[PDB]
């Protein structure tokens, strides 16, 4: 019967809340007060990788920080050389709607997904230079809205069926399915140690899944609305999230609760992408508002603002070395700041 | 007309015609015009301006042409002279007429 | 009693050659080109001598000074068709005749009139006839110590300037003729004593002294009809004893040159300056906002920019006219010939024609492309793009700058009227040109109206709900068409009527139609087309935010 | 056509009753013919016609005055010599 299990779960949740409160001896701001805040951050557009037709909805940086990908809704997935804005590749896709893109960490393969319910993996280091579908990983029952590569052989995707899926490329089957969740799952982040990854969704509760264990370890529900993005702290011991309610948040995996909440009164626009800096001081965020914001990760201060886009900023990415950042909005222009 | 005091009208005359380098004088009959017409002088010489006084002159003149008997080469063979049709007495156009005083020069060549 | 020295082989006349003669009345020296020199005092003293004529002595280089000296009864002196270079000396005749006449004639080689050339000449009044001579200039005090009844510098084409002090020591003149002299300006002194002035065919005499200087002027005759307007100010044998209250001036001003200021009526002088300012800032801002726009230029925005530039050129023309009116306030006639024929009037006419034609062509192109985009709206690939727009607009610029250049090439003249509009319709070529321009403007308005009507009939839905949206379309499209019509129809109708040589208005009233109806487009285009659109407003708020004034 | 010898007549304007002011008016000779070849060389300006002019002038006159104080030249005898105010 529902009642006894429901009350047992309620008691468990109350116990978790009590433990977290007892463990909340002091907040981050209390101990950070002695830190001198960094001055205003000067970021200016260094490149404008135009030439893309439809509104960019997803991009991503390469491991070497040389090549980057931007996928639009016209069927195009373009691979740019950031240094000299060279269209290194332009893959035409089957389904016009694309909601993500990724890389094999070696830099060989790329991935994509969308409303077609089918992830598609393309190979770049082919024989004759002809870029063609390396594989089509079908099986999901919801729109696939993220892609991240553990290695060149495994891909962990998230779709709108409330279930993440770890696929083996060559095998092309459900190597693992993470289903202990409800609502559309949209954002995946792989920590420097690839055994763990966080996932956000529309249920306002991000989760921390383990690749090998096959089930979530922790759930964080500090948000009030849908979650649109997520990213690990560079050391992998914390992660940031953004939601439609215009509030950035930063949670810890060890403390198992929200370390801090970055918010501002003038912002009532939902977030769409977040990303830490190579050292962690700077947290970047893109909003439905046509500007991007760089905030102090430990002070919540509005360190800097970027206003080089004419439409909603929908995708953002920081290079591994941190030498530059890239933003792609719904104006079809991908702009690199530094 | 009146034998005494006729007016400006055309009269025939015998004019000597030559050109730049002809050693021979030609003489041909053509038309000039002469006669009288009223004249005025202002008695009140002073604040009032002078009164113009006209002279008999042409109003419409045509041209005749003639070839001379073997004049020296280097000049156009055919020369031309003027023939007077009608005349009235008006001011002598200095730019067009040389209105001088009593000369009574013969109109034949020498 | 009379001497006729004709065709003699005489080269030199010795001094006092005529001594012992007492009954001579006349001396004639004509057709003696063998003569070259005349000694001084050649006519030292004769009692009854009164008339002297020299008529053809082409080889006469000059007459020694004092040739005519101490002759009381010498009355008429003539020297004509002589190759004299130095001005003949007459200062020592010391005549006593009451109406002495001095004649200089056909001496093409005389260079100038020396100053004080008539000291001790005659104790009584004198007349001077300097016809035809090739004087280069007249220096100060050229006329001195004698009442000068008549001065006639007629047909001295080579004369270029008369010193302002030439009449300082002379009394008068009473009559002054400067016809065909191409003189620059009259002397500033001595003109008050002039009774009658003749300056016909003196085109270079563009500026005349003030009216108050001509206190004694009657029977004036000038070469430019406009100049006579300076004499509108109130204070048989032609026998009389009192001068007319006002001078009688000829030729009478023509229809093209009424005795008015550049801006006819007083109120216009204000209305222009307002239409000046309203016609500059807006079109400037439209250019300023749309040229500093971050966002890419779409075809209608480029057309808006060029339309605003054309209207800016119109405003600049109006500003030039207003500044000229302000500078020549109340005494236009003095500067009329100088400015109406100078570079300023040609520049104003070119601005008018170029700006008007460019604005009309741009409005027609805007309407045509609007119709093209609204009719073939579903076929999204047929939309006119910027390359074709730039090509068509370069063609339009060439057409506008070519039609506005023909008046400078003789097809028409901007110099016919003060406002510098191309009203030259004498020759058939100018008439057909003007009629062609006016008919092109009329056809432009007609095609704009037809394209707008087709747009309205295309958008209209004959079956679905369109009762409340068709009304707005019709309303504002009628506003646009009515602004164009109120700018075009009056001006075009009057211009076409007057271009067939059937004028229905006077040039003085024509001024009103410039201020009240001509710049209507030039001041209403930016508001109906540019200022009120969402894109321009949004760019304007962007600029305000950049400057912080938002 | 008729034109009289130029002789003295009454002045309609200034002749007061009993004060005869006599001014002489009428006509003399005038003619025009093409310039002769022997005369063209002697003239600086190219020409096509010469003219012989004759107007009658007062070779004897005396000073008088009329109501107003202005000088007047009452002519006593005029005869016809060259024409003075005849070029334009």
């Amino acid at each position: 019967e529902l009642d006894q299990l429901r009350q047992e779960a309620e008691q468990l949740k109350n116990q978790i809340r009590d433990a977290r409160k007892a463990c909340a001896d002091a907040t981050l701001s209390q101990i950070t007060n002695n830190i001198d805040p960094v001055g205003r951050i000067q970021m200016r557009t260094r490149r404008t990788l135009r030439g893309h037709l439809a509104k960019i909805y997803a991009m991503h940086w390469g491991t070497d920080s040389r090549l980057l990908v931007s996928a639009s809704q016209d069927g195009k997935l373009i691979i740019w050389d950031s240094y000299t804005t060279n269209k290194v590749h332009a893959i035409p896709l089957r389904s016009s709607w694309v909601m993500t893109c990724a890389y094999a960490p070696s830099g060989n393969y790329v991935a994509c997904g969308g409303l077609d319910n089918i992830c598609s993996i393309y190979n770049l280091k082919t024989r004759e230079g002809n870029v063609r579908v390396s594989r089509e990983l079908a099986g999901h029952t919801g729109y696939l809205s993220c892609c991240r590569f553990l290695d060149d052989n495994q891909i962990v995707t998230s779709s709108g069926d409330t279930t993440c899926a770890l696929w083996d490329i060559e095998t092309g089957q459900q190597t693992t399915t993470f289903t202990g969740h409800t609502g559309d799952v949209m954002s995946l982040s792989l920590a420097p140690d690839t055994r763990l990854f966080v996932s956000g969704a529309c249920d306002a509760s991000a989760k921390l899944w383990d690749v090998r264990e096959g089930m979530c370890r922790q759930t964080f529900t500090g948000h009030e609305s849908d979650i649109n993005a997520i990213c690990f702290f560079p050391n992998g011991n914390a992660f940031a999230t953004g939601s439609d309610d215009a509030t950035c948040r930063l949670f810890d995996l060890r403390a198992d609760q929200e370390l801090m909440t970055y918010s501002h009164d003038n912002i009532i626009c939902g977030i769409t992408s977040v990303s830490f800096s190579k050292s962690g001081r700077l947290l970047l965020a893109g909003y439905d508002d046509f500007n991007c914001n760089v905030w102090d990760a430990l002070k919540a201060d509005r360190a800097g603002v970027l206003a080089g886009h004419d439409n909603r900023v929908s995708c953002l990415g920081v290079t591994d070395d941190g030498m530059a950042v890239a933003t792609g909005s719904w104006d079809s222009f991908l702009k690199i700041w530094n | 007309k009146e034998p005494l005091r006729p007016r400006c009208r055309p009269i025939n005359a015998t004019l000597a015609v030559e050109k730049e380098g002809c050693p021979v004088c030609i003489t041909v009959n053509t038309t000039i015009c002469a006669g009288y017409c009223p004249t005025m002088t202002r008695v009140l010489q002073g604040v009032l301006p002078a009164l113009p006084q006209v002279v008999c002159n042409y109003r419409d003149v045509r041209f005749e042409s003639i070839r001379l008997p073997g004049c020296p080469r280097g000049v156009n063979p055919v020369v031309s002279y003027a023939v007077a049709l009608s005349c009235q007495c008006a001011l002598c156009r200095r730019s067009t007429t040389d209105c001088g005083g009593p000369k009574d020069h013969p109109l034949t060549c020498d | 009693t009379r001497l006729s020295l004709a065709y003699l082989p005489v080269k030199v006349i010795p001094s006092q050659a005529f001594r012992g003669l007492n009954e001579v009345i006349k001396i004639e020296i004509s057709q003696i080109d063998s003569l070259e020199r005349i000694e001084a005092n050649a006519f030292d003293n004769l009692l009854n001598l009164s008339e002297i004529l020299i008529q053809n002595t082409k080889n006469l280089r000059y007459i020694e000074p004092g040739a005519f000296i101490n002759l009381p009864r010498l009355k008429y002196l003539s020297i004509c068709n002589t190759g004299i270079r130095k001005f003949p000396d007459v200062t020592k005749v010391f005549s006593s005749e009451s109406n002495f006449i001095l004649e200089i004639c056909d001496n093409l080689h005389i260079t100038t009139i020396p100053g004080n050339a008539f000291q001790g000449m005659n104790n009584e009044s004198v007349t001077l006839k300097l016809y035809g001579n090739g004087f280069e200039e007249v220096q100060s005090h050229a006329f001195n110590g004698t009442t000068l009844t008549s001065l006639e510098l007629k047909e001295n084409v080579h004369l270029e300037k008369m010193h302002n002090g030439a009449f300082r020591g002379a009394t008068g003149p009473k009559t002054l003729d400067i016809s065909s002299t191409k003189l620059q300006a009259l002397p500033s002194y001595g003109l008050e004593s002039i009774q009658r002035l003749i300056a016909t065919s003196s085109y270079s005499l563009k500026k005349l002294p003030s009216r108050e200087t001509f206190v004694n002027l009657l029977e004036a005759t000038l070469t430019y009809p406009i100049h006579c307007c300076a004499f509108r100010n109130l204070p048989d044998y032609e026998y009389g004893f009192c001068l007319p209250k006002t001078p009688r001036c000829a030729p009478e001003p023509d229809a093209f040159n009424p005795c008015e200021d550049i801006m006819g009526y007083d109120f216009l002088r204000v209305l222009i300056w307002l239409i000046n300012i309203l016609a500059i800032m807006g079109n400037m801002t439209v250019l300023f906002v749309l040229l500093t726009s971050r966002y890419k230029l779409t075809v209608p925005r480029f057309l808006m920019c060029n339309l605003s530039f054309a209207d800016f050129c119109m405003g600049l023309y109006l500003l030039l006219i207003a500044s000229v009116d302000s500078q020549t306030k109340g005494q236009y006639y003095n500067h009329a010939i100088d400015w109406q024929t100078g570079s300023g009037c040609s520049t104003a006419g070119f601005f008018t024609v170029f700006a008007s034609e460019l604005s009309v062509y741009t409005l027609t192109v805007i309407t045509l492309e609007r119709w093209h985009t609204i009719t073939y709206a579903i076929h999204l690939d047929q939309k006119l793009r910027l390359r074709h727009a730039i090509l068509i607009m370069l063609g339009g610029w060439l057409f506008s700058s070519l039609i506005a250049m023909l008046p400078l090439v003789g097809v028409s003249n901007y110099m016919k009227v003060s406002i510098c509009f191309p009203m030259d319709v004498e020759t058939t070529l100018s008439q057909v040109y003007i009629l062609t321009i006016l008919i092109l403007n009329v056809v432009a308005f007609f095609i704009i109206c037809a394209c707008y009507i087709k747009i309205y009939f295309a958008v209209r839905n004959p079956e679905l709900m369109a009762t409340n949206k068709d009304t707005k379309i019709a309303k504002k499209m009628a506003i646009l068409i009515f602004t164009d019509f109120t700018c075009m129809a009056p001006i075009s109708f009057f211009a076409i009527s007057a271009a067939f040589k059937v004028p229905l208005i006077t040039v003085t009233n024509s001024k009103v139609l410039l201020v009240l109806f001509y710049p209507i487009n030039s001041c209403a285009n930016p508001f109906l087309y540019a200022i009120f659109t969402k894109t321009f407003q949004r760019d304007f708020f962007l600029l305000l935010s950049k400057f912080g004034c938002c | 056509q008729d034109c009289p010898e130029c002789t003295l007549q009454e002045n309609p304007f200034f002749s007061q009753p009993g004060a005869p002011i006599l001014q002489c008016m009428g006509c003399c000779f005038s003619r025009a013919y093409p310039t002769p070849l022997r005369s063209k060389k002697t003239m600086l300006v190219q020409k096509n016609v010469t003219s012989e002019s004759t107007c009658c002038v007062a070779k004897s006159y005396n000073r008088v005055t009329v109501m107003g104080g202005f000088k007047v030249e009452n002519h006593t005898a005029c005869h016809c010599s060259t024409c003075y105010y005849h070029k334009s």
Binding site: L5, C23, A26, G180, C216, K278, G322, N338 | - | - | -
Partner: protein
């Protein structure tokens, strides 16, 4: 009904989540500060660099 299956899965999931041990927030903040300060020197955005090293012009 699948409602009981969902309820049992939910209670099992919360049971598994609850057994995890937590760490004091002070320790987490100290570790974050230490990591963020020990690597603040090498970051190109905290301390901008001249055009000699910066390859983006």
């Amino acid at each position: 009904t699948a409602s009981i299956a969902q309820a049992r899965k939910l209670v099992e999931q919360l049971k598994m989540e609850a057994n995890i041990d937590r760490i004091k927030v002070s320790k987490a903040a100290a570790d974050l500060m230490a990591y963020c300060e020990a690597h603040a020197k090498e970051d190109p955005l905290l301390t901008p660099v001249p055009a000699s090293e910066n390859p983006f012009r």
